[PDB]
Every structure is written in structure tokens, then in C-alpha cells.
């Protein structure tokens, strides 16, 4: 399931910080950076356990990402979201991980923050 992220400030340097809130992952010609999409299309993504390299007729999300949840109950950071594509039967995009915690209330589109990162 794909979701569009919202609540982002508008203004080569790419940032993904939250003080101003940014999450730059445009399509171009704390281990926040996970992988890249190129384009059939090529997907190179480093998930929490394995590096996955696949070439498929991917139907990528308009705003693809991975997500790590923080559980205050055990102070454990665990990967819970993989929202890169809906299907997998010259341009590229960077895949960044989001952080979600008790400090980030809201829904799938707004209930998030980001660890310091740049590229």
C-alpha cells in the first residue's frame, strides 16, 4: 500500500531533517538512506536484514519509502514499513527511511519524523 507524505516545508543538496521539516526524495535524471530506484525498472534497497536487488515491471509509489518504528516499551527500533511499490510483475529516486514514534501522532501521511540525513 502506497501513501503520499504531507506536512513538508518548501524552499546538489538534499536534506531530510526535522527541527522546518524536510524529506527530500525527488526523482532526478542513523542509516536513513536505504536504496535507489532506477528507470522495466531496477530496485536496489537495503532493508533491515537483507540487500534486495530486483528488476521488474514495478508500479512504484508516487512517494516511496521505508519506515522504522520506535517502541518506547523496550527502546527498540524495528522496521515495520515497506512502501516502495504496489506491484512487481534515465531517472532515479532515493529511498529514505521514516521514523515513527509516540512523538509523531497522526496518520500514515503525517505521523512521521526523520533522523538527520543528507545527500
Amino acid at each position: 500500500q502506497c501513501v503520499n507524505l504531507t506536512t513538508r516545508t518548501q524552499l546538489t543538496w538534499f536534506h531530510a531533517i526535522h527541527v522546518t521539516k524536510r524529506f527530500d526524495n525527488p526523482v532526478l535524471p542513523s542509516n536513513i538512506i536505504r536504496g535507489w530506484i532506477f528507470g522495466q525498472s531496477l530496485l536496489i534497497v537495503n532493508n533491515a536484514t537483507n540487500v534486495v536487488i530486483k528488476v521488474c515491471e514495478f508500479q512504484f509509489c508516487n512517494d516511496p519509502f521505508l519506515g522504522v518504528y520506535y517502541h518506547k516499551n523496550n527502546k527498540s527500533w524495528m522496521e515495520s514499513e515497506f512502501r516502495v511499490y504496489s506491484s512487481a510483475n534515465t531517472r532515479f529516486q532515493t529511498l529514505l527511511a521514516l521514523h515513527r514514534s509516540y512523538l509523531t501522532p497522526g496518520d500514515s501521511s503525517s505521523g512521521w519524523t526523520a533522523g538527520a540525513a543528507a545527500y
Partner: antibody, heavy 126, light 107 residues
Framework: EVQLVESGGGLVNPGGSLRLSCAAS????????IHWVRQAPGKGLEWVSSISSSSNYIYYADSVKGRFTISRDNAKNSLSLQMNSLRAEDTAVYYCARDGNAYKWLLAENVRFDYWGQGTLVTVSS | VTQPASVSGSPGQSITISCTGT?????????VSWYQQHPGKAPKLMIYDVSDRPSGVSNRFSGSKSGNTASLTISGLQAEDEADYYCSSYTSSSTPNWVFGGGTKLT
């Protein structure tokens, strides 16, 4: 103190339309999903619709789906519900309620209503 | 979602209000909540996530669930408790929605 104040109730004819709205205070409006629930006189509660904080996730009861439109203005801390082509069957007290689940990204399906407004009566007759 | 039309008992007694649904509503989803509505007033949340209790709610109210039936148990019944108690749950049938039971009148 968390408050929700419904306005825009009143009497309308069948086949007409009515906009309801409620203002929020005491909490961060943009952090919560808000639901509408209606209660016909002498009857129980029926869920009507819900709008997520991002307004990206919107749900309607089948009984109102296709007629009702829900929207929210986060800047003004104001939630609106537009009811078109309404009927006598829609007579009820409408409430807007704050979803107690502040983490809809974890359990979107898990809904509870921590705070309710006073409610406003909508009557459809002539 | 089915509930008793009404329940009653002497003050000081424990009254159990049942809420029977199906596997798609109560059985497979521990999202059951209970609301107390006083005449002329908006309903208050008493129990959520089957058994959890919101702050500000007395400890006489406790929820439980077994099979496809959820229950609200009210200990130390007070005269103050007279109200209509509604059972709410998430139903995954067809298009996702949320429902309420008929509502149990407690006297």
C-alpha cells in the same frame, strides 16, 4: 480542556442540503482523526464518516456514501460536513468526535472516541 | 452487533453487558470499546481495546472478551450508573467501517 462545538444544525426540506461544521480547541487539531456519528431520536448511535488528519484517508458509511462530503481546514481548526440530497431518514443528532487513537499509522482500524461535542440536531421534514 | 435490550440488578451487584458479533467484527479484532450515554448528553468513552480504561473513568468498570462476545462488567453498581451503554467495534466486511450495537439500557 478538549472541546468540540457543532454548528449549522436546523430544519431543512427533503431533497435539500445542509452544511455542518465544528470547531476544535484544547488539542492539536492536525494530530487527530475526527469522526461524525449520528443518533436518530429514540435510537442508538450510527457511525457516519471520518476524515484523517492529512485528509487523505476518508471513509463513509454505505448509508451516506455518495451523498455526504467531508473536509477539514487544519489552518482554522475547523471540520465541515456537506450533506447533499438528504432525506427524512437522515433526521438525527450529529456529533463530531475526536479519535483517541493518535497513531493511525500503526492500527488504522482501531477506533475509539475520546471526546465528543455537544451535538447538533438536523431535522428533515416539511 | 447484538446487545441485550436492558440489564438490571440491585445496588452493589456486578452487572455484565454482553456484545455478540462475528469473527470479522469481535472475534478477530480486539478493538471493542464501550460508551456511556446519559439522557440528553453526548456519550463518554468508558473502555477501549477490550479492557483498557481511560483516565478519569472509575475502576469499577472493566471489559473482557471471549470468542465472538465482548462484555462490560460494572462492579459496585451505583444509582449514578443508569445509562445507555453502547458497544462499538471495527468490522472488516466489504468496505471497512465501524459499527455500534443496539445499546443496553442499564437501570
Amino acid at each position: 480542556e478538549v472541546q468540540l462545538v457543532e454548528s449549522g444544525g436546523g430544519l431543512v426540506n427533503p431533497g435539500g442540503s445542509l452544511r455542518l461544521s465544528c470547531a476544535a480547541s484544547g488539542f492539536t487539531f492536525s494530530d487527530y482523526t475526527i469522526h461524525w456519528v449520528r443518533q436518530a431520536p429514540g435510537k442508538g448511535l450510527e457511525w457516519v464518516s471520518s476524515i484523517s488528519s492529512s485528509s487523505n484517508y476518508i471513509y463513509y458509511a454505505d448509508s451516506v456514501k455518495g451523498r455526504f462530503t467531508i473536509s477539514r481546514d487544519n489552518a482554522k481548526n475547523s471540520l465541515s460536513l456537506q450533506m447533499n440530497s438528504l432525506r427524512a431518514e437522515d433526521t438525527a443528532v450529529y456529533y463530531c468526535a475526536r479519535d483517541g487513537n493518535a497513531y493511525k499509522w500503526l492500527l488504522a482500524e482501531n477506533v475509539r472516541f475520546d471526546y465528543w461535542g455537544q451535538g447538533t440536531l438536523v431535522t428533515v421534514s416539511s | 452487533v447484538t446487545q441485550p435490550a436492558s440489564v438490571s440488578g440491585s445496588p452493589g451487584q456486578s452487572i455484565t453487558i454482553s456484545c455478540t458479533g462475528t469473527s470479522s467484527d469481535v472475534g478477530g479484532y480486539n478493538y471493542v470499546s464501550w460508551y456511556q450515554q446519559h439522557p440528553g448528553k453526548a456519550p463518554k468513552l468508558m473502555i477501549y481495546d477490550v479492557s483498557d480504561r481511560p483516565s478519569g473513568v472509575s475502576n469499577r468498570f472493566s471489559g473482557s472478551k471471549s470468542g465472538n462476545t465482548a462484555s462490560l462488567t460494572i462492579s459496585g453498581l451505583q444509582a449514578e450508573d443508569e445509562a445507555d451503554y453502547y458497544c462499538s467495534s471495527y468490522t472488516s466486511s466489504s468496505t471497512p467501517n465501524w459499527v455500534f450495537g443496539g445499546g443496553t439500557k442499564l437501570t
